[PDB]
Design a protein around this ligand. Structure first.
Ligand code: CLA
Ligand code: CLA
Ligand code: CLA
Ligand code: CLA
Ligand code: CLA
Ligand code: CLA
Ligand code: CLA
Ligand code: CLA
Ligand SMILES: CCCCCCCCCCCCCCCC(=O)OC[C@H](COP(=O)(O)OC[C@@H](O)CO)OC(=O)CCCCCCCCCCCCCCC
Ligand SMILES: CC1=C(/C=C/C(C)=C/C=C/C(C)=C/C=C/C=C(C)/C=C/C=C(C)/C=C/C2=C(C)CCCC2(C)C)C(C)(C)CCC1
Ligand code: SF4
Ligand code: SF4
Ligand code: SF4
Lengths: 220, 141, 74, 80, 146, 742
């Protein structure tokens, strides 16, 4: 069971270094953008020409590699937590037999250890684990909110904000109030940063709540 | 060429829409496109809907320069009509924009001086460190 | 123990991404090709393709075979 | 206002000028190419940065380059 | 620059909300600020490092003070295998009565949080034994931050 | 004049264009230079109006494509009947439908996969099916495997017929454009001919083959001693014993004594207690009335004789002080644009599928369908998904019509013009409605979660707390329960058991249907549904209305219907095309349908489905936990997702092991989609640049230059994988849960 998870960790490491090294070594330019150094470390793109230039800057390579870093660290932390929680319970054989296939990870680690956490508050009362139960769903919600910024892009939101500006300008008793900064949608690079921040915050909080609650419901 | 002035010519027949001018025209600027038509005819509006252009002079006020140019290129391509447009400020000042020289910009013309022309290939721009702690860009040199 | 291990590993993961991000920023802002002629730092830009392709091969091999073994066991 | 620059690899096919949505570019006389004309950008204050000119550029690499710079009400395409 | 940010004139003339968002996001990129010099860059970084150290000292002083004030360190050093360490107290007006009862752990008289940072074991190992020791450590760390 | 108009031998039948990929378009026919070509060939395969500008040429192509689709559907039906006849336990299920699970698929003994042949009962091993074919076959009167073989053969013959018809009508007799534009004749024939005569024939089959055989089956006689269907036509005496009225012949029909047929033509309502489904005598009368209604309806329009209506005449006479010229000009639009008709038909079909899904669970038409929970859940979810997809396609093709076929200079319409002149007001109002609904629906769940987490159950929105009762739906239920007595006196029972008539139908110790109670939790989920529907409508309507132009892009029509962007200018112009709006609205349609099916599953397992003992006590699958647990997000996470996933995660080593494997595979594909959704092609082209170097170093670089996927194609791949993984996760989880516990 350890042999497979160690190679998963190695794959995660290699892929993350691949992304980061490719971003660093192509920062000054490439065949698609020979003059990349002339635009800086962080720029949105080079436009729809030459086939399309989405996420061509070096900052975008880091933005992509953060997801792989999070996935790799999640793998190593899952491994550590599952290997220790079974050792503290007196039955290592649960990990030895169930870690060789991924359904074992899904059922005997995630599903099995979330029984106490999700029962922090229920229609029959609450206990001291309710904070972690609330934070579990809080992290889920933030993680899902990040998908909005990571999937939907700017033009849809700008065209929608135009209609809201018209609606405010035509509403009685609200024309008396005027904005001082013109409302615009988030920038292309700004939205990537915001979505990545939401993704990372949800990723950290969900696992922190799950780990603390699962290790504190039974104390190993 | 001496740019033409702005008369009080009529406007196309239109029922009104929510896509017209907003308070930005009141405080910052708006644009005016004028053309001449041989007959009354339907034309799509850049703000949505269809209007009727009258025969003779036609004047239309819009919020952006891009709207004026889009309508102008549509007129030139579909109706074969020459057009002009101007920028109008809240204090009544009118600035003539296009066609600037009296000739459309895709056609070469004498009297124009190049702005932003670099006498080098794009691959000969200097590295950022050479312009570090100076206020200049590599492409401005 | 679990909280400390997870905390420190996630911090290390973020720091290691920062190390490469600033290394990338150096190549754009501070790198002087003329003052680094044919030293160990220019040769990396010389065979970046060989480096990237080999990293891609290693990652592809690891992913293919690890996932295949996991799915076979499943 | 964004920055639009023209390099002497221009062949003067006037493709950028007729792809401009805000009339930023124009053609001026020249002697460095067979067409005897080169592009110029005298009205970059109306530039929006859509980079439509670079999509119409036939030269390799591009002869017209757009650099996104300080943002104004004209450059963000705001009508309100 | 006449408005915010004052270090970027180009951002200051932006008439949209983007002027604010970007002003926060480029505050510590000293290299791209208006009229920046190498001497100013190095001096600003040197100054910022001191503020970071002050924040680090203040955080540790706060942890020590709260452990000494609302914790159960003296009762924990007598039963480390059966006393749950306390980080700090809880005062939330939104709490209900079952929440007040459920969060009264350790030997506390009200809702508290159980510390999982391992500061109790670390401080017990290095010789600290009483609440007064933590109190005088917190004052020293505040002095260092100042 | 309305007459047949054809052209002889318009296109020669040859294999020469099969050997030239991309022949249909000017650009693609030249051959590939990069890999993008390979994708462009498949994306433009069925974009007929982009191949040619001739309306007649396009129409002939769609006419033949429909024949091809019909042939494929006939092949699928033939396969289903053949597998029922050859690899099924239908004949054993007929004699014991309450204890035997339907199965029509048997796997081969290879690589250990033979574990999927589970014990479905009746001395048969196979895969349990949830299509509901067994109950439909029992309703139709099918009793032996031989009649299924004949149906399979007939369906094969019909598939061959449709394929030959498609070839003949594209290559030999191609109808002219005037033939297609004869909309009045088409409407008349589809209303009276197709629907009316089809329903009349089905009614005849029901009163002659279905009613007697099902009367024998419900009486408890062996299927192998029921007289054959033709025996009920040969000697009418056999038919005069179950129903003596048949002794009178057709005299009562022609003399207008219809009450004499009350034996087999009824207005009952409710369900058959032996069967648990609608009375067959009710269904036959329903179809006989529908036949007359449609036959009369199909006589409304004028084709060649003076009588009838003109569609243009009706359209041009509907105008008012608020709508100008009115509907004038719509006849020209709908007779010259395939995309507008496709949009309208897709919207109507998608809406009708959802109605079918809602009506089939509340009024089970087929025998022994209500107590087969796996079939009911599967049918409901399947039809909900089909309806949602068709509805999204409606918006896509409306946007396509707006981009391509809209022309105010030649095809002006006042209504469409006036809609386009106040689109800002429509979109802003829908935005406000979406925000208000999202707050006042989802934030109540957050309020409940926070109150429960804070130890304040008395401050929540619940039936034992601050109440939010759906009084309007409760009043409608009470009104429908009282219908048989005051407003539908000829009806014996209400149209459904769920209205509240205080009765429950039990078949084989299992609850078929019972009055469904509505409370605060239902009030919450219904407004959640409304919020998601409104957001999907907002996304799609904004794309349709702003496809031609916007204040950001005055000339969005020249960019086409499907383009990535208009550059990073104006702050950023990503996903401004109408295609992107469909791409985004697919996610929200998925979200809405997922919430609807989750609601249905939990409610049915908690308050309707269950078991009943020979004491009169009902025990539901989850014991009525919906009312107090479905009011918090933690309740959905714990008592629905965590509790009911316990089946699919412990299915390894059993006959349900294929659902856990599909569970994991769907999770994997859903995660895989995020690589495409979160990135862009500029990184991938640069990465490919390095691999191309490695290939060139070893002289293995292909001539077809590798290209990263286009900006639009990456979005399509991401959304397709996202939808596939998400829908398959629920498919596996639902099927495993409802087969193990149902
Ligand atoms: C010793 C460590 C160190 C130092 C001195 C710097 C210093 C610098 N970095 Mg850097 N960096 C670091 C570590 C460091 N970094 C690490 C570890 C990473 C990887 C994560 C990065 C990634 C990084 C990028 C990608 C970039 C920089 C940039 C910069 C420069 C400008 C920073 C700026 O504008 O701040 C502005 C920073 C912010 C406004 C922070 C945003 C808020 C974040 C997302 C935290 C949000 C937390 C969230 C709200 C929590 C919610 C909780 C919930 C309960 C509500 C500056 C020279 C930028 C630059 O100019 O490069 C040329 C740039 O583009 N760095
Ligand atoms: C679970 C989701 C998932 C998966 C499986 C992958 C997989 C991969 N990513 Mg990736 N990625 C993801 C999410 C995911 N990513 C997300 C969310 C992001 C953030 C945007 C990224 C960002 C990212 C970057 C930036 C990079 C990668 C790279 C890679 C590749 C690394 C090499 C490898 O593992 O080879 C193993 C390959 C696989 C596991 C792919 C699956 C192959 C299947 C199982 C075999 C075929 C099955 C069957 C025959 C097909 C039939 C289906 C159909 C024909 C009917 C690999 C293809 C790197 C790369 O390209 O290196 C080569 C790279 O540079 N990814
Ligand atoms: C939508 C319709 C549909 C579907 C999904 C199925 C599905 C199935 N049928 Mg089925 N069937 C159908 C319609 C359908 N049928 C119809 C209409 C009929 C009436 C003619 C039948 C008659 C029928 C019979 C009689 C049997 C099945 C069987 C099966 C099962 C196994 C099929 C198999 O392995 O293929 C067999 C494999 C192939 C046909 C090969 C695929 C050919 C493609 C073109 C690739 C060719 C490459 C080739 C294999 C390589 C060698 C070529 C050579 C040059 C070297 C499978 C569940 C079998 C079963 O359930 O066994 C228990 C079985 O015995 N079916
Ligand atoms: C008898 C054989 C025959 C022959 C030689 C031709 C020859 C021709 N036809 Mg024709 N056709 C035929 C039968 C035939 N047809 C039939 C039976 C129909 C009725 C459906 C049509 C309907 C038809 C139309 C509507 C059109 C043609 C066209 C053409 C021309 C080019 C088509 C081409 O490149 O095909 C190559 C394409 C294929 C081989 C694709 C076949 C795909 C099949 C039909 C669908 C099966 C897909 C199925 C869902 C697979 C699912 C599994 C998958 C997931 C793996 C060419 C002259 C076109 C034309 O005139 O060009 C301008 C045209 O518009 N034909
Ligand atoms: C009573 C007459 C009648 C009937 C029954 C139909 C029936 C049908 N028409 Mg149709 N049509 C009619 C008159 C009729 N039409 C007239 C008068 C016109 C000209 C105004 C059209 C113009 C027309 C178009 C343009 C299209 C249809 C289509 C369809 C099919 C819709 C798909 C469906 O519901 O599948 C139901 C499937 C069945 C009921 C299976 C049985 C198939 C039936 C029995 C075959 C119909 C035979 C036909 C009426 C006469 C055959 C000619 C003869 C020489 C053999 C359906 C088969 C669409 C289609 O799919 O095309 C293929 C389509 O695109 N029709
Ligand atoms: C399209 C549907 C359809 C078809 C094909 C048939 C066909 C038939 N029906 Mg029939 N029937 C139908 C619908 C249909 N029915 C419906 C909806 C009802 C309910 C009102 C009936 C009620 C009915 C009765 C009561 C009887 C038939 C009978 C018959 C048979 C002889 C009819 C005859 O020649 O004398 C009548 C034909 C003309 C006057 C012409 C014939 C097989 C008779 C029979 O022999 O029973 C087996 C008979 O007694 N039918
Ligand atoms: C009867 C319904 C119907 C019809 C006739 C059409 C017809 C058309 N649509 Mg359309 N559409 C429909 C329903 C329909 N659509 C629905 C329901 C939706 C919403 C999802 C859409 C969304 C849609 C968009 C967004 C677009 C079209 C486009 C088009 C046109 C080009 C189609 C083409 O070349 O595809 C070629 C076919 C393919 C490339 C095959 C795609 C394969 C799919 C993605 C895989 C499906 C997954 C599969 C079920 C699972 C298999 C598992 C796998 C392991 C084997 C054509 C006129 C395009 C256009 O330009 O119109 C002018 C366009 O941009 N449609
Ligand atoms: C769970 C993740 C999530 C959430 C919460 C949202 C939320 C929203 N999306 Mg969305 N979206 C997401 C994921 C998500 N999205 C993803 C993954 C995609 C990609 C497919 C999209 C794509 C998408 C599109 C394309 C559209 C939306 C729209 C909307 C808005 C609908 C209006 C509404 O309900 O406002 C109500 C607000 C909420 C329900 C948010 C939760 C608020 C609760 C009540 C807590 C608030 C308490 C209080 C304010 C906290 C203050 C404390 C203080 C300290 C700050 C809303 C802001 C639409 C829109 O803008 O229409 C107006 C729209 O067009 N989204
Ligand atoms: C609400 C009042 C209402 O529905 O009145 C209905 C009103 C009736 O319009 P007319 O009577 O002028 O229309 C006549 C024909 O178009 C009817 O076929 O429609 C409108 O005024 C346009 C706005 C409809 C959408 C309003 C939101
Ligand atoms: C003694 C001993 C041993 C050995 C050990 C060793 C030898 C280790 C090593 C280790 C190592 C050896 C590690 C390393 C690591 C590395 C890294 C981690 C790196 C990173 C990098 C980076 C991050 C980069 C960056 C950059 C860029 C990108 C650009 C340019 C600039 C710079 C540089 C900034 C043994 C085992 C036998 C046993 C035990 C004892
Ligand atoms: S979409 Fe984003 S990335 Fe693709 S072109 Fe427009 S801006 Fe550049
Ligand atoms: S940026 Fe857009 S507008 Fe300015 S020049 Fe290049 S193309 Fe013409
Ligand atoms: S496009 Fe290239 S060639 Fe045509 S004008 Fe602009 S620069 Fe000169």
């Amino acid at each position: 069971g350890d042999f497979l998870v160690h190679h998963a960790i190695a794959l995660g490491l290699h892929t993350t270094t691949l992304i980061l090294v490719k971003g660093a070594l192509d920062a000054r330019g490439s065949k698609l953008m020979p003059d990349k150094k002339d635009f800086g470390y962080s720029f949105p793109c080079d436009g729809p020409g030459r086939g399309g230039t989405c996420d061509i800057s070096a900052w975008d390579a880091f933005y992509l590699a953060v997801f792989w870093m999070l996935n790799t660290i999640g793998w190593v932390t899952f491994y550590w937590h599952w290997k220790h929680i079974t050792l503290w319970q007196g039955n290592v054989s649960q990990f030895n037999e169930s870690s060789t296939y991924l359904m074992g990870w899904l059922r005997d680690y995630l599903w099995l250890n979330s029984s106490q956490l999700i029962n922090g508050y229920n229609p029959f009362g609450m206990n001291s684990l309710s904070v972690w139960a609330w934070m579990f769903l809080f992290g889920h919600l933030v993680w899902a909110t990040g998908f909005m910024f990571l999937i939907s892009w700017r033009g849809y939101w700008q065209e929608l904000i135009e209609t809201l500006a018209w609606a405010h300008e035509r509403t009685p008793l609200a024309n008396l109030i005027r904005w001082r900064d013109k409302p615009v949608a988030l920038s292309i690079v700004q939205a990537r940063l915001v979505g990545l921040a939401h993704f990372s915050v949800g990723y950290i909080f969900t696992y922190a709540a799950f780990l603390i609650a699962s290790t504190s419901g039974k104390f190993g | 060429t001496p740019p033409q002035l702005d008369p009080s010519t009529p406007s196309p027949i239109f029922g009104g829409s929510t896509g017209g001018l907003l308070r930005k025209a009141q405080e910052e600027e708006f644009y005016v496109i004028t053309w001449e038509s041989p007959k009354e005819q339907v034309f799509e509006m850049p703000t949505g809907g269809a209007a009727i252009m009258r025969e003779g002079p036609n004047l239309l006020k819009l919020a952006r320069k891009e709207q004026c140019l889009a309508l102008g290129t549509r007129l030139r391509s579909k109706y074969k009509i020459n057009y002009q447009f101007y920028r109008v400020f809240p204090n009544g000042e009118v600035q003539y924009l296009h066609p600037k020289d009296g000739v459309y910009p895709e056609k070469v013309n004498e009297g124009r001086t190049g702005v932003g022309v670099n006498l080098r290939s794009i691959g000969k721009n200097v590295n950022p460190i050479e312009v570090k702690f100076t206020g200049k860009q590599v492409y401005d040199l | 123990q679990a909280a400390l291990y997870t905390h420190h590993q996630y911090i290390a993961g973020f720091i290691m991404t920062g190390a490469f991000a600033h290394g990338a920023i150096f190549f754009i802002r501070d790198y002087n090709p003329e003052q680094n002629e044919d030293n160990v730092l220019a040769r990396m830009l010389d065979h970046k393709e060989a480096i990237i392709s080999h990293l891609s091969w290693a990652s592809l091999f690891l992913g293919f075979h690890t996932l295949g073994l996991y799915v076979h066991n499943d | 206002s964004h920055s639009v620059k023209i390099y002497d690899t221009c062949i003067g096919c006037t493709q950028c000028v007729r792809a401009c949505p805000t009339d930023v570019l124009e053609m001026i006389p020249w002697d460095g190419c067979k067409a005897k004309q080169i592009a110029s950008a005298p009205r970059t204050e109306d530039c929006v940065g859509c980079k439509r000119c670079e999509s119409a550029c036939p030269t390799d690499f591009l002869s017209v380059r757009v650099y996104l710079w300080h943002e104004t009400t004209r450059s963000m395409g705001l009508a309100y | 620059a006449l408005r915010f940010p004052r270090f970027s004139q180009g951002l200051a003339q932006d008439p949209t909300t983007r002027r604010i968002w970007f002003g926060i996001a480029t505050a510590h990129d000293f290299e791209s600020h208006d009229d920046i010099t190498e001497e100013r860059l190095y001096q600003n970084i040197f100054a910022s490092h001191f503020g970071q150290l002050a924040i680090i000292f203040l955080w540790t002083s706060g942890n020590l003070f709260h452990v000494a004030w609302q914790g159960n360190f003296e009762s924990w050093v007598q039963d480390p295998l059966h006393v749950r360490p306390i980080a700090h107290a809880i005062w939330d007006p939104h709490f209900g009565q079952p929440a007040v009862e459920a969060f009264t752990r350790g030997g506390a008289l009200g809702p508290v949080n159980i510390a999982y940072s391992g500061v109790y074991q670390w401080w017990y190992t290095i010789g600290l034994r009483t609440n007064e020791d933590l109190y005088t450590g917190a004052l020293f760390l505040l002095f260092l931050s100042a | 004049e309305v007459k047949i108009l054809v052209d002889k031998d318009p296109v020669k039948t040859s294999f020469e264009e099969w050997a030239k990929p991309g022949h249909f378009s000017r650009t693609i026919a030249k051959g590939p230079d990069t890999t993008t070509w390979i994708w462009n060939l498949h994306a433009d395969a069925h974009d007929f109006d982009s191949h040619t500008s001739d309306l007649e040429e396009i129409s002939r192509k769609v006419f033949s494509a429909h024949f091809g689709q019909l042939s494929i559907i006939f092949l699928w039906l033939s396969g289903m009947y053949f597998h029922g006849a050859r690899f099924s336990n239908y004949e054993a299920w007929l004699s014991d439908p309450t204890h035997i699970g339907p199965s029509a698929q048997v796997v081969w003994p290879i690589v250990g996969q033979e574990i999927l042949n589970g014990d479905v009962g009746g001395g048969f091993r196979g895969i349990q099916i949830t299509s509901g074919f067994f109950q439909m076959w029992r309703a139709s009167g099918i009793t032996s495997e031989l009649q299924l073989y004949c149906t399979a053969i007939g369906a094969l013959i019909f598939a061959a017929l449709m394929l030959f018809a498609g070839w003949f009508h594209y290559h030999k007799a191609a109808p002219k454009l005037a033939w297609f534009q004869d909309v009045e004749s088409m409407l008349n024939h589809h209303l009276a001919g197709l629907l009316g005569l089809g329903s009349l024939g089905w009614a005849g089959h029901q009163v002659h083959v279905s009613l007697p055989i099902n009367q024998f089956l419900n009486a408890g006689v062996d299927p192998k001693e029921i007289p054959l269907p033709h025996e009920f036509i040969l000697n009418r005496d056999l038919l005069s014993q179950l129903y003596p009225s048949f002794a009178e012949g057709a005299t009562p029909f022609f003399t207008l004594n219809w009450s004499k047929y009350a034996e087999f033509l009824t207005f009952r309502g409710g369900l058959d207690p032996v069967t648990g489904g609608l009375w067959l005598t009710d269904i036959a009368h329903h179809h006989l009335a529908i036949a007359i209604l449609f036959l009369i309806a199909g006589h409304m329009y004028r084709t060649n004789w003076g009588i009838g209506h003109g569609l243009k005449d009706i359209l041009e006479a509907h105008k008012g002080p608020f709508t100008g010229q009115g509907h004038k000009g719509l006849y020209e639009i709908l007779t010259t644009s395939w995309h507008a008709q496709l949009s309208l038909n897709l919207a109507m079909l998608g809406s009708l599928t959802i109605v079918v899904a809602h009506h089939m669970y509340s009024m089970p038409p087929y025998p022994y369908l209500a107590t087969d929970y796996g079939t009911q859940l599967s049918l409901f979810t399947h039809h909900m998904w089909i309806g949602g997809f068709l509805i999204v396609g409606a918006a896509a093709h409306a946007a396509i019509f707006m981009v391509r076929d809209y022309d105010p200079t030649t095809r002006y319409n006042d209504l469409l013009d006036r809609v386009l002149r106040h689109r800002d007001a429509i979109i802003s109002h829908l935005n406000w409605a979406c925000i208000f609904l999202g707050f006042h629906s989802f934030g109540l769940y957050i309020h409940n979660d926070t109150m429960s987490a804070l130890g304040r159950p008395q401050d929540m929105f619940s039936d034992t707390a601050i109440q939010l009762q759906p009084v309007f739906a409760q009043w409608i239920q009470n009104t429908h329960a009282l219908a048989p007595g005051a407003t539908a006196p000829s009806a014996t029972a209400s149209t459904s058991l769920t209205w509240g008539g205080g009765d429950l139908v039990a078949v084989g110790g299992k609850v078929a249907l019972l009055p469904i109670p509505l409370g605060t939790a239902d009030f919450l989920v219904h407004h959640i549904h409304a919020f998601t529907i409104h957001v999907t409508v907002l996304i799609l309507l904004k794309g349709v209305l702003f496809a031609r132009s916007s204040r950001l892009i005055p000339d969005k029509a020249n960019l086409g219907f499907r383009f990535p962007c208009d550059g990073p200018g104006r702050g950023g112009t990503c996903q401004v095309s109408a295609w992107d709006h469909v791409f985004l609205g697919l996610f929200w349609m998925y979200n809405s349908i997922s919430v609807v099916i989750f609601h249905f599953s939990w409610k049915m397992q908690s308050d309707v489905w269950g078991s009943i003992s020979d004491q009169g006590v009902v025990t539901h699958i989850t014991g009525g936990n919906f009312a107090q647990s479905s009011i918090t997000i933690n309740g959905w996470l714990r008592d629905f997702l965590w509790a009911q996933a316990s089946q699919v995660i412990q299915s390894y080593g059993s006959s349900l092991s294929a659902y856990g494997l599909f569970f994991l595979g769907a999770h994997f594909v859903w995660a895989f989609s995020l690589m495409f959704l979160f990135s862009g092609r500029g990184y991938w082209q640069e990465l490919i640049e390095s691999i191309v170097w490695a290939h060139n170093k070893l002289k293995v670089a292909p001539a077809t230059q590798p290209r990263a996927l286009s900006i639009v194609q990456g979005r399509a791949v991401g959304v397709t994988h996202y939808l596939l993984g998400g829908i398959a996760t629920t498919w596996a989880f639902f099927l495993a849960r409802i087969i193990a516990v149902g």
